[PDB]
Coordinates of C-alpha atoms and ligand atoms in Angstrom, one line a residue:
Chain A
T1 CA 4.8 26.0 -24.7
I2 CA 3.2 25.8 -21.0
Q3 CA 6.8 25.6 -19.1
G4 CA 8.1 25.8 -15.8
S5 CA 6.8 25.2 -12.3
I6 CA 3.2 23.9 -12.4
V7 CA 1.6 23.4 -9.0
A8 CA -0.7 20.5 -8.4
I9 CA -2.7 22.6 -6.2
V10 CA -4.5 21.3 -3.2
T11 CA -8.1 21.8 -2.9
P12 CA -8.2 23.6 1.0
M13 CA -11.2 22.3 3.1
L14 CA -12.8 23.6 6.3
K15 CA -12.9 21.2 9.3
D16 CA -16.1 19.5 8.3
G17 CA -14.7 18.9 4.7
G18 CA -16.4 21.6 2.8
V19 CA -14.3 23.3 0.0
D20 CA -12.9 26.3 1.8
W21 CA -13.3 28.8 -1.2
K22 CA -11.7 32.0 0.3
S23 CA -8.3 30.1 1.2
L24 CA -8.3 28.8 -2.3
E25 CA -8.5 32.3 -3.5
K26 CA -5.6 33.4 -1.4
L27 CA -3.6 30.6 -2.7
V28 CA -4.0 31.1 -6.4
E29 CA -3.4 34.8 -5.7
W30 CA -0.2 33.8 -3.8
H31 CA 1.0 31.3 -6.3
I32 CA 0.5 33.9 -9.1
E33 CA 2.6 36.6 -7.2
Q34 CA 5.5 34.0 -5.8
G35 CA 6.4 32.9 -9.4
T36 CA 4.4 29.6 -10.1
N37 CA 4.1 29.2 -13.8
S38 CA 0.6 27.4 -14.0
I39 CA -1.9 25.8 -12.0
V40 CA -3.4 22.1 -12.2
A41 CA -6.9 22.3 -10.5
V42 CA -8.7 19.1 -9.3
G43 CA -5.8 16.8 -10.0
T44 CA -4.7 14.0 -7.4
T45 CA -3.4 16.3 -5.1
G46 CA -6.6 18.5 -5.4
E47 CA -8.3 15.4 -4.4
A48 CA -10.3 15.0 -7.6
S49 CA -11.5 11.4 -6.2
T50 CA -13.6 13.0 -3.4
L51 CA -14.9 15.9 -4.8
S52 CA -18.4 15.8 -6.5
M53 CA -18.8 16.5 -10.3
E54 CA -20.3 19.8 -9.5
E55 CA -17.5 20.7 -6.9
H56 CA -15.0 19.8 -9.7
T57 CA -16.5 22.5 -12.0
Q58 CA -17.1 25.1 -9.3
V59 CA -13.3 24.5 -8.0
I60 CA -11.9 24.7 -11.6
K61 CA -14.2 27.9 -12.1
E62 CA -13.0 29.9 -9.1
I63 CA -9.4 29.2 -9.8
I64 CA -9.7 30.3 -13.6
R65 CA -11.7 33.4 -12.5
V66 CA -9.0 34.4 -9.9
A67 CA -6.4 33.5 -12.1
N68 CA -7.7 36.1 -14.8
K69 CA -5.8 34.9 -17.8
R70 CA -2.6 35.6 -16.1
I71 CA -0.9 32.0 -16.1
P72 CA -2.5 29.2 -18.1
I73 CA -4.7 26.8 -15.9
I74 CA -4.9 23.2 -16.5
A75 CA -7.9 21.0 -15.3
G76 CA -7.5 17.6 -13.9
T77 CA -10.4 15.5 -16.1
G78 CA -9.1 11.9 -16.1
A79 CA -11.6 9.1 -15.3
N80 CA -11.4 5.3 -15.8
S81 CA -14.5 5.5 -18.1
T82 CA -14.1 7.1 -21.5
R83 CA -17.4 8.4 -21.9
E84 CA -17.1 10.1 -18.5
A85 CA -13.8 11.4 -19.3
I86 CA -15.1 13.0 -22.6
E87 CA -17.8 14.7 -20.5
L88 CA -15.1 16.2 -17.9
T89 CA -12.9 17.3 -20.4
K90 CA -15.7 19.0 -22.3
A91 CA -17.1 20.9 -19.2
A92 CA -13.3 21.8 -18.9
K93 CA -13.1 23.3 -22.3
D94 CA -16.5 24.9 -21.9
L95 CA -15.0 26.7 -18.5
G96 CA -12.3 28.1 -20.6
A97 CA -9.6 26.1 -19.0
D98 CA -6.3 26.2 -20.9
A99 CA -5.8 22.3 -20.9
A100 CA -6.8 19.2 -19.5
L101 CA -4.5 16.6 -17.4
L102 CA -5.9 13.1 -17.9
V103 CA -4.6 10.3 -15.7
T104 CA -4.5 6.9 -17.3
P105 CA -7.8 5.0 -16.8
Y106 CA -7.1 3.6 -13.0
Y107 CA -8.3 0.2 -11.5
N108 CA -9.7 -1.4 -14.7
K109 CA -6.3 -2.1 -16.3
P110 CA -7.1 -1.2 -19.8
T111 CA -4.6 -2.7 -22.5
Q112 CA -2.2 -0.3 -24.5
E113 CA -4.4 -0.4 -27.3
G114 CA -7.2 0.5 -25.2
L115 CA -5.2 3.4 -23.6
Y116 CA -4.6 4.6 -27.1
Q117 CA -8.2 4.4 -28.1
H118 CA -9.2 5.9 -24.8
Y119 CA -7.0 9.1 -25.2
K120 CA -7.7 9.1 -29.1
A121 CA -11.4 9.2 -28.4
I122 CA -11.1 12.0 -26.0
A123 CA -8.8 14.1 -28.4
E124 CA -11.1 13.6 -31.3
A125 CA -14.1 14.4 -29.2
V126 CA -12.8 17.5 -27.3
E127 CA -11.0 20.5 -29.1
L128 CA -8.5 21.4 -26.1
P129 CA -4.8 20.7 -25.5
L130 CA -4.6 17.3 -23.5
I131 CA -1.9 16.2 -21.4
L132 CA -1.4 12.4 -20.5
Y133 CA -0.6 11.3 -16.9
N134 CA 1.3 8.2 -15.9
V135 CA 1.6 7.0 -12.3
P136 CA 1.6 3.2 -12.2
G137 CA 1.8 3.0 -8.5
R138 CA -1.6 4.6 -8.3
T139 CA -3.4 3.3 -11.3
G140 CA -2.5 -0.2 -12.0
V141 CA -1.3 0.5 -15.5
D142 CA 1.7 1.7 -17.0
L143 CA 1.2 3.7 -20.3
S144 CA 4.3 2.7 -22.4
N145 CA 6.8 5.1 -23.9
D146 CA 5.6 3.4 -27.1
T147 CA 2.2 4.2 -26.8
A148 CA 2.9 7.7 -25.5
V149 CA 4.9 8.0 -28.8
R150 CA 2.0 6.8 -30.8
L151 CA -0.5 9.3 -29.3
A152 CA 2.1 12.2 -29.6
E153 CA 1.0 12.2 -33.2
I154 CA -2.6 13.5 -32.4
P155 CA -2.3 17.2 -32.9
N156 CA -3.9 18.2 -29.4
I157 CA -2.3 15.7 -27.2
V158 CA 0.3 18.0 -26.2
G159 CA 2.1 16.5 -23.2
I160 CA 2.5 13.7 -20.7
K161 CA 3.2 14.0 -17.1
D162 CA 5.5 11.3 -16.1
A163 CA 5.3 10.3 -12.6
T164 CA 7.4 7.2 -12.7
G165 CA 10.4 8.9 -11.2
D166 CA 12.4 6.7 -13.6
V167 CA 14.9 9.2 -15.2
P168 CA 16.5 6.5 -17.9
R169 CA 13.1 5.9 -18.9
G170 CA 12.1 9.7 -19.1
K171 CA 15.3 10.5 -20.9
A172 CA 14.4 7.6 -23.3
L173 CA 10.9 8.9 -23.7
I174 CA 12.1 12.8 -24.5
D175 CA 14.5 11.5 -27.0
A176 CA 12.1 9.1 -28.6
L177 CA 9.7 11.9 -29.2
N178 CA 11.0 15.3 -30.5
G179 CA 9.0 18.3 -29.7
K180 CA 6.3 15.9 -30.9
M181 CA 4.9 16.4 -27.4
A182 CA 6.0 18.0 -24.0
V183 CA 7.3 15.8 -21.2
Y184 CA 6.6 17.3 -17.6
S185 CA 7.9 15.6 -14.4
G186 CA 5.7 14.3 -12.0
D187 CA 8.2 13.2 -9.5
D188 CA 9.2 16.1 -7.3
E189 CA 12.5 14.0 -6.2
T190 CA 13.7 13.6 -9.7
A191 CA 12.1 16.6 -11.5
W192 CA 15.3 18.6 -11.6
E193 CA 17.2 16.0 -13.5
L194 CA 14.4 15.4 -16.0
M195 CA 14.5 18.8 -16.7
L196 CA 18.0 19.2 -17.3
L197 CA 17.5 16.3 -19.8
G198 CA 14.9 18.1 -21.8
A199 CA 11.6 18.0 -19.5
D200 CA 9.5 21.1 -20.3
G201 CA 8.5 21.7 -16.6
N202 CA 7.4 20.1 -13.2
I203 CA 3.9 19.4 -12.2
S204 CA 4.8 19.9 -8.6
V205 CA 3.6 18.6 -5.3
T206 CA 6.2 20.7 -3.4
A207 CA 5.1 23.8 -5.2
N208 CA 2.4 24.1 -2.9
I209 CA 4.6 25.0 -0.1
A210 CA 7.5 26.5 -1.8
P211 CA 6.4 28.2 -5.0
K212 CA 9.1 30.7 -5.4
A213 CA 11.9 28.2 -4.8
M214 CA 10.4 25.7 -7.2
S215 CA 10.0 28.4 -9.7
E216 CA 13.6 29.3 -9.6
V217 CA 14.6 25.4 -9.8
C218 CA 12.6 24.9 -12.9
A219 CA 13.7 27.9 -14.7
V220 CA 17.4 27.0 -14.0
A221 CA 17.0 23.4 -15.0
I222 CA 15.0 24.0 -18.1
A223 CA 18.1 26.4 -19.1
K224 CA 20.3 23.6 -18.5
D225 CA 22.2 25.1 -15.5
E226 CA 23.1 21.7 -14.0
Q227 CA 25.3 23.4 -11.2
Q228 CA 22.8 25.8 -9.8
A229 CA 20.1 23.3 -10.5
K230 CA 21.5 20.8 -8.1
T231 CA 22.2 23.5 -5.5
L232 CA 18.8 25.4 -5.5
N233 CA 17.1 22.0 -5.4
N234 CA 19.2 20.7 -2.6
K235 CA 17.8 23.6 -0.4
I236 CA 14.3 21.9 -0.9
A237 CA 15.2 18.2 -1.3
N238 CA 14.2 17.0 2.0
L239 CA 10.7 18.4 1.3
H240 CA 10.2 16.3 -1.8
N241 CA 11.0 13.3 0.2
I242 CA 9.0 14.1 3.4
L243 CA 5.7 15.4 1.7
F244 CA 5.2 11.7 0.8
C245 CA 5.7 10.1 4.3
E246 CA 2.0 9.3 3.9
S247 CA 0.1 9.5 0.6
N248 CA 0.0 12.8 -1.2
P249 CA -1.9 15.0 -0.5
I250 CA -2.0 14.0 3.1
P251 CA 1.4 15.6 4.2
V252 CA 1.1 18.6 2.0
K253 CA -2.2 19.6 3.2
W254 CA -0.7 19.6 6.8
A255 CA 2.5 21.4 5.7
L256 CA 0.1 24.1 4.4
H257 CA -1.9 24.2 7.7
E258 CA 1.1 24.3 9.6
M259 CA 1.9 27.6 7.6
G260 CA -1.7 29.0 8.4
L261 CA -2.6 29.0 4.8
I262 CA -5.3 26.3 4.8
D263 CA -7.5 24.4 7.4
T264 CA -7.2 20.7 8.4
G265 CA -9.9 19.5 6.0
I266 CA -9.6 16.4 4.1
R267 CA -11.9 14.0 2.8
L268 CA -12.0 10.2 3.6
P269 CA -10.9 7.7 2.6
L270 CA -8.1 10.3 3.1
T271 CA -7.2 11.4 6.7
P272 CA -5.2 14.1 8.5
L273 CA -1.5 13.5 8.5
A274 CA -0.8 11.2 11.3
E275 CA 0.5 13.2 14.7
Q276 CA 3.8 10.9 14.4
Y277 CA 4.9 12.9 11.3
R278 CA 3.7 16.4 12.3
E279 CA 7.0 17.7 14.3
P280 CA 9.2 16.2 11.5
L281 CA 7.2 18.2 9.2
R282 CA 7.5 21.4 11.3
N283 CA 11.1 20.8 11.5
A284 CA 11.4 20.3 7.7
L285 CA 9.5 23.6 7.1
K286 CA 12.0 25.3 9.4
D287 CA 15.1 23.7 8.3
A288 CA 14.3 24.9 4.8
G289 CA 13.1 28.4 6.0
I290 CA 9.8 28.1 5.1
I291 CA 8.3 29.1 8.4
Chain B
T1 CA -22.7 -16.2 5.8
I2 CA -22.5 -16.8 2.0
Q3 CA -20.8 -20.0 0.9
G4 CA -19.9 -21.6 -2.3
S5 CA -19.5 -20.4 -5.7
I6 CA -20.2 -16.5 -6.4
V7 CA -20.0 -15.6 -9.8
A8 CA -18.7 -12.2 -10.6
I9 CA -21.0 -11.9 -13.4
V10 CA -20.3 -9.9 -16.7
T11 CA -22.5 -7.2 -17.8
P12 CA -23.7 -8.5 -21.2
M13 CA -23.5 -5.6 -24.0
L14 CA -24.7 -5.1 -27.6
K15 CA -22.3 -4.0 -30.3
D16 CA -22.6 -0.5 -29.6
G17 CA -22.2 -0.8 -26.0
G18 CA -25.7 -0.8 -24.5
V19 CA -26.5 -3.2 -21.9
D20 CA -27.8 -6.4 -23.3
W21 CA -30.7 -6.9 -20.9
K22 CA -32.2 -10.1 -22.6
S23 CA -28.7 -12.0 -22.2
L24 CA -28.3 -10.7 -18.7
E25 CA -31.8 -12.3 -17.8
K26 CA -30.7 -15.6 -19.4
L27 CA -27.2 -15.6 -17.8
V28 CA -28.7 -15.4 -14.2
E29 CA -31.3 -18.0 -14.9
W30 CA -28.4 -20.3 -16.3
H31 CA -26.6 -19.9 -13.2
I32 CA -29.2 -20.7 -11.0
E33 CA -30.0 -23.9 -13.0
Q34 CA -26.3 -24.9 -13.1
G35 CA -25.5 -24.7 -9.5
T36 CA -24.4 -21.0 -8.9
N37 CA -24.5 -20.2 -5.2
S38 CA -24.5 -16.5 -5.5
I39 CA -24.0 -13.7 -7.8
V40 CA -22.1 -10.4 -7.3
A41 CA -23.7 -7.8 -9.5
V42 CA -21.4 -5.2 -11.3
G43 CA -18.3 -5.9 -9.5
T44 CA -15.2 -5.5 -11.6
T45 CA -15.9 -8.5 -14.0
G46 CA -19.3 -6.7 -14.9
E47 CA -17.6 -3.2 -15.8
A48 CA -18.8 -1.3 -12.8
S49 CA -16.4 1.5 -13.5
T50 CA -18.0 2.1 -17.0
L51 CA -21.6 1.8 -16.3
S52 CA -23.8 4.7 -15.5
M53 CA -25.1 5.1 -12.0
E54 CA -28.6 4.5 -13.3
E55 CA -27.5 1.6 -15.4
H56 CA -25.7 0.6 -12.2
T57 CA -29.0 0.3 -10.1
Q58 CA -30.9 -1.2 -13.2
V59 CA -28.6 -4.1 -13.4
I60 CA -28.8 -4.9 -9.8
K61 CA -32.4 -4.6 -9.9
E62 CA -32.7 -7.1 -12.8
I63 CA -30.6 -9.8 -11.3
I64 CA -32.5 -9.4 -8.1
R65 CA -35.6 -9.5 -10.1
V66 CA -34.8 -12.6 -12.0
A67 CA -33.1 -14.7 -9.2
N68 CA -36.4 -14.4 -7.5
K69 CA -34.9 -14.8 -4.0
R70 CA -33.6 -18.2 -5.2
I71 CA -29.9 -17.4 -4.4
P72 CA -28.5 -14.3 -2.4
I73 CA -27.5 -11.3 -4.4
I74 CA -24.3 -9.3 -3.8
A75 CA -23.9 -5.8 -5.1
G76 CA -20.4 -4.4 -5.8
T77 CA -20.6 -0.8 -4.3
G78 CA -17.1 0.1 -3.9
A79 CA -15.8 3.7 -4.6
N80 CA -12.7 5.6 -3.8
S81 CA -15.1 8.1 -2.1
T82 CA -16.4 7.3 1.3
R83 CA -19.3 9.6 0.4
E84 CA -20.1 8.0 -2.6
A85 CA -19.4 4.2 -1.2
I86 CA -22.1 5.1 1.6
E87 CA -24.5 6.4 -1.3
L88 CA -24.0 3.2 -3.6
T89 CA -24.3 1.0 -0.6
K90 CA -27.5 2.7 0.7
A91 CA -29.1 2.2 -2.9
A92 CA -28.3 -1.5 -2.8
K93 CA -29.8 -2.0 0.4
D94 CA -32.9 -0.4 -0.7
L95 CA -33.0 -2.3 -3.9
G96 CA -33.1 -5.4 -2.0
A97 CA -29.4 -6.8 -2.3
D98 CA -28.4 -9.2 0.6
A99 CA -24.8 -7.7 0.9
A100 CA -22.5 -5.2 -0.7
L101 CA -19.1 -5.9 -2.0
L102 CA -16.5 -2.9 -1.3
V103 CA -13.2 -2.9 -3.3
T104 CA -10.6 -0.8 -1.3
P105 CA -10.6 2.7 -2.6
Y106 CA -8.2 2.9 -5.5
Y107 CA -5.9 5.4 -7.0
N108 CA -5.9 7.8 -4.0
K109 CA -3.8 5.4 -1.7
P110 CA -5.6 6.0 1.5
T111 CA -3.5 4.8 4.6
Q112 CA -4.1 1.7 6.8
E113 CA -5.8 3.9 9.3
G114 CA -7.7 5.4 6.3
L115 CA -8.8 2.2 5.2
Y116 CA -10.1 1.4 8.5
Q117 CA -12.2 4.8 9.0
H118 CA -13.4 4.4 5.4
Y119 CA -15.0 0.9 6.2
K120 CA -16.0 1.8 9.6
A121 CA -18.1 4.7 8.2
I122 CA -19.8 2.8 5.6
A123 CA -20.5 0.2 8.0
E124 CA -22.2 2.6 10.5
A125 CA -24.1 4.4 7.8
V126 CA -26.0 1.4 6.3
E127 CA -27.1 -1.6 7.8
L128 CA -26.4 -4.3 5.1
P129 CA -23.7 -6.9 5.3
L130 CA -20.4 -5.7 3.9
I131 CA -17.7 -7.7 2.3
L132 CA -14.1 -6.1 2.0
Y133 CA -12.3 -6.7 -1.4
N134 CA -8.7 -6.4 -1.5
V135 CA -7.0 -6.6 -5.1
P136 CA -3.6 -4.4 -4.6
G137 CA -2.6 -4.9 -8.2
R138 CA -5.6 -2.8 -9.5
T139 CA -5.8 -0.2 -6.7
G140 CA -2.4 0.6 -5.7
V141 CA -3.3 0.0 -2.1
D142 CA -3.0 -3.1 -0.2
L143 CA -5.3 -3.8 2.9
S144 CA -3.1 -5.5 5.3
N145 CA -4.0 -8.5 7.5
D146 CA -4.1 -6.5 10.6
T147 CA -6.2 -4.0 9.2
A148 CA -8.5 -6.7 8.3
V149 CA -8.7 -8.1 11.7
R150 CA -9.5 -4.6 13.0
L151 CA -12.4 -4.2 10.7
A152 CA -13.6 -7.9 11.3
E153 CA -14.7 -6.6 14.8
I154 CA -17.7 -4.7 13.3
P155 CA -20.7 -6.7 13.2
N156 CA -22.0 -6.0 9.9
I157 CA -18.4 -6.3 8.0
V158 CA -19.0 -10.1 7.3
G159 CA -16.4 -10.9 4.9
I160 CA -13.4 -10.3 2.9
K161 CA -12.5 -11.0 -0.8
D162 CA -8.8 -11.7 -1.0
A163 CA -7.6 -11.5 -4.5
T164 CA -4.0 -11.4 -3.9
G165 CA -3.4 -15.2 -4.9
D166 CA -1.1 -15.2 -2.2
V167 CA -2.0 -18.6 -0.5
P168 CA 0.2 -18.4 2.4
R169 CA -0.8 -14.9 3.1
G170 CA -4.4 -16.2 2.9
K171 CA -3.6 -18.8 5.4
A172 CA -2.3 -16.3 7.8
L173 CA -5.6 -14.1 7.0
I174 CA -7.8 -16.8 7.7
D175 CA -6.0 -17.9 11.1
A176 CA -5.8 -14.5 12.3
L177 CA -9.5 -13.5 11.7
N178 CA -10.5 -16.7 14.1
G179 CA -13.9 -16.6 12.1
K180 CA -14.7 -12.9 12.7
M181 CA -15.5 -12.6 8.9
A182 CA -15.8 -14.9 6.1
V183 CA -12.8 -15.0 3.5
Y184 CA -13.4 -15.4 -0.3
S185 CA -10.9 -16.3 -2.9
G186 CA -10.7 -13.5 -5.7
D187 CA -8.2 -15.6 -7.6
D188 CA -9.4 -18.3 -9.5
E189 CA -6.3 -20.2 -9.9
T190 CA -5.6 -20.6 -6.2
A191 CA -9.3 -20.7 -5.3
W192 CA -9.5 -24.3 -4.2
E193 CA -6.5 -23.9 -2.1
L194 CA -7.9 -21.2 -0.2
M195 CA -10.9 -23.0 0.5
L196 CA -9.3 -26.3 1.4
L197 CA -7.8 -23.8 4.0
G198 CA -11.1 -22.6 5.4
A199 CA -12.2 -19.8 2.8
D200 CA -16.1 -19.7 2.7
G201 CA -16.3 -19.5 -1.3
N202 CA -14.7 -18.1 -4.3
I203 CA -16.0 -14.8 -5.9
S204 CA -15.0 -16.3 -9.3
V205 CA -14.3 -15.0 -12.8
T206 CA -14.4 -18.5 -14.3
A207 CA -17.9 -19.4 -13.0
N208 CA -18.9 -17.3 -15.5
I209 CA -18.2 -19.8 -18.2
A210 CA -18.1 -23.0 -16.0
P211 CA -20.6 -22.4 -13.4
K212 CA -21.5 -26.0 -12.6
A213 CA -17.9 -27.2 -12.8
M214 CA -17.1 -24.4 -10.4
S215 CA -20.0 -25.0 -8.2
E216 CA -19.0 -28.6 -7.4
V217 CA -15.2 -27.6 -7.2
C218 CA -16.5 -25.2 -4.2
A219 CA -18.7 -27.7 -2.6
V220 CA -16.1 -30.3 -2.6
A221 CA -13.2 -27.9 -1.3
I222 CA -15.3 -26.5 1.4
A223 CA -16.0 -29.9 2.7
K224 CA -12.4 -30.2 2.7
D225 CA -12.0 -33.3 0.4
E226 CA -8.6 -32.5 -1.0
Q227 CA -8.4 -35.1 -3.7
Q228 CA -11.7 -34.5 -5.1
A229 CA -11.1 -30.8 -4.9
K230 CA -7.7 -31.0 -6.8
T231 CA -9.1 -33.6 -9.4
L232 CA -12.2 -31.6 -10.2
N233 CA -10.3 -28.2 -10.3
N234 CA -8.0 -29.7 -12.6
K235 CA -10.5 -30.0 -15.3
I236 CA -10.9 -26.3 -15.8
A237 CA -7.5 -25.1 -14.4
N238 CA -6.1 -24.2 -17.8
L239 CA -9.3 -21.8 -18.0
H240 CA -8.4 -20.1 -14.9
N241 CA -5.1 -19.1 -16.6
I242 CA -6.4 -18.0 -19.9
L243 CA -9.2 -15.9 -19.0
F244 CA -6.6 -13.5 -17.6
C245 CA -4.5 -13.4 -20.9
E246 CA -5.6 -9.8 -21.0
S247 CA -7.1 -7.6 -18.3
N248 CA -10.4 -9.3 -16.8
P249 CA -13.1 -9.1 -18.0
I250 CA -11.9 -8.8 -21.5
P251 CA -11.0 -12.5 -21.9
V252 CA -14.3 -13.7 -20.1
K253 CA -16.6 -11.5 -22.2
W254 CA -15.2 -12.9 -25.3
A255 CA -15.5 -16.4 -24.0
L256 CA -19.0 -16.1 -23.6
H257 CA -19.6 -14.9 -27.1
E258 CA -17.7 -17.8 -28.6
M259 CA -20.3 -19.8 -26.4
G260 CA -22.7 -17.8 -28.2
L261 CA -24.1 -16.5 -24.9
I262 CA -23.6 -12.9 -25.5
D263 CA -22.5 -10.3 -28.0
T264 CA -19.1 -8.5 -28.4
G265 CA -19.9 -5.4 -26.6
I266 CA -17.4 -4.1 -24.0
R267 CA -16.8 -0.2 -23.2
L268 CA -13.7 1.6 -23.5
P269 CA -11.2 2.0 -22.2
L270 CA -11.6 -1.9 -22.1
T271 CA -11.4 -3.4 -25.4
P272 CA -12.7 -6.7 -27.4
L273 CA -10.0 -9.5 -26.8
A274 CA -7.1 -9.0 -29.2
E275 CA -7.1 -11.3 -32.1
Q276 CA -4.1 -13.4 -31.4
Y277 CA -6.1 -14.7 -28.3
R278 CA -9.2 -15.8 -29.8
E279 CA -8.0 -19.2 -31.1
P280 CA -6.2 -20.4 -28.1
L281 CA -9.2 -19.5 -26.0
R282 CA -11.5 -21.5 -28.5
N283 CA -9.1 -24.3 -27.8
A284 CA -9.3 -24.1 -24.0
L285 CA -12.9 -24.2 -24.2
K286 CA -13.1 -27.1 -26.5
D287 CA -10.7 -29.0 -24.5
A288 CA -12.6 -28.1 -21.2
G289 CA -15.8 -29.3 -22.6
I290 CA -17.6 -26.1 -22.7
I291 CA -17.9 -26.3 -26.4
Ligands
LIG301 N1 -6.8 -8.5 -10.7 C1 -7.6 -8.9 -11.8 C2 -6.7 -9.8 -12.8 C3 -6.8 -9.6 -14.4 C4 -5.8 -9.2 -15.2 C5 -4.5 -10.1 -15.4 N2 -4.1 -9.7 -16.9 C6 -9.1 -9.3 -11.8 O1 -9.1 -10.8 -11.5 O2 -9.8 -8.8 -11.6

């Protein structure tokens, strides 16, 4: 039911690295007016890793407040500890977020059965719609289609963000399920295809800088208009590629700065996009008529 | 510079998950008696990611209490947040820890420059000897040899735990460092090889169950006695392989329990060793002469 273009929104920061509230505000508002269907707050793109547990709440809150029940808001609440994921998700519900996006425990390489217990534990512990999130490159673990299918049986595990970028594997996953649980693309570059094949939307990085263009791509692809999907997406294909020239959200945060929407702030270990990539990015934003 | 067998000690747990403090005390004591040269408290093998920050400090404190200055104690204090890492390293220092082990930020894929700035910051904020820790398979990031050689310039970055298991890569690491910082194997299977090549020690998982064996293996290898190193290590070579049949620390914990040294406790997402593996493990243990 949460469908379409879901922006994994960045957490804007001041030069000193403090959360720039106002700029955030302008973003949420801007997204809600440009077409964006929903927002993921404090996810990878929103630097969940470098924000204190209180900044998580405060940031999730500001966004829910500004949204004003207009679009659903999803809170990033994954962690590699189960007790702690349960806490974050609970706080997400209590803040009245519509859903929680939980990445697979990273770094500790839990087994498939563990991933199963992990997610089942959280689902039983909190009464909120949960979305699984697989992105092996970052986590060290790969939630198997099989396991995901196993979890689809739990009534409040309602979806999964597949960031593999592996299309065949994604179609297999969509078919293996039924509307048992939704599938969301996590790979901007292949998202249009995943959606043409059944995926219910795209938790996008690109949406941070091309919300209207991405809204239109998702609507059209979910509708199965392959021709128009390839064409609307083509006008922003390069972006998907170059917004990853360095680890997300590094490039997207600079792109935004090059749009006067946010400030250079970004927390270590992350760093401001390297000089070397800046012009190629400015160029990318022009070629695509973004600025 | 710490040399020898450095055990990545497990954090003993009671059935319900609480830290088994009595067992921990005895393990530490057993290690010093068996020949263990140093202990890494709350590292990966010690379930650092599922322990409370307070449990984290308490474990460090306890181990330093029991060791009673007889061996140096290394505290794992890595985090994917620079602020968080500094906080945790400051605490370890204040707790009396001889040095800290910091895994590269995981999940958020910082850049090489980012890894450099990350470690430089922690080094400048805390005056405690620091040891870098690279294990790409778990972190999603790979601290290159070039970056390690840069960080080796910094006065209090004394060493690097190389868990790649890529010996030729380790040969290049050690040759390029020109002694600026020590190198430790983070891969039990190849550890004796890295040491013969120049590595100062092994931050070992196997030492958890074969402390005296790994202790003489380390001494001999560091002494550059290639035949004694090979034949001593051969005795417990199957152990190095089977302690990873499932993600560490799942296997080692079960090993200790079969040795009747600890209870079955282990926190989620981690799970107790899958049934099918428990028998082959006991056989490995029996064959090795541990039971
Ligand atoms: N990198 C891991 C390997 C364990 C997982 C192998 N199945 C460690 O030694 O901490």
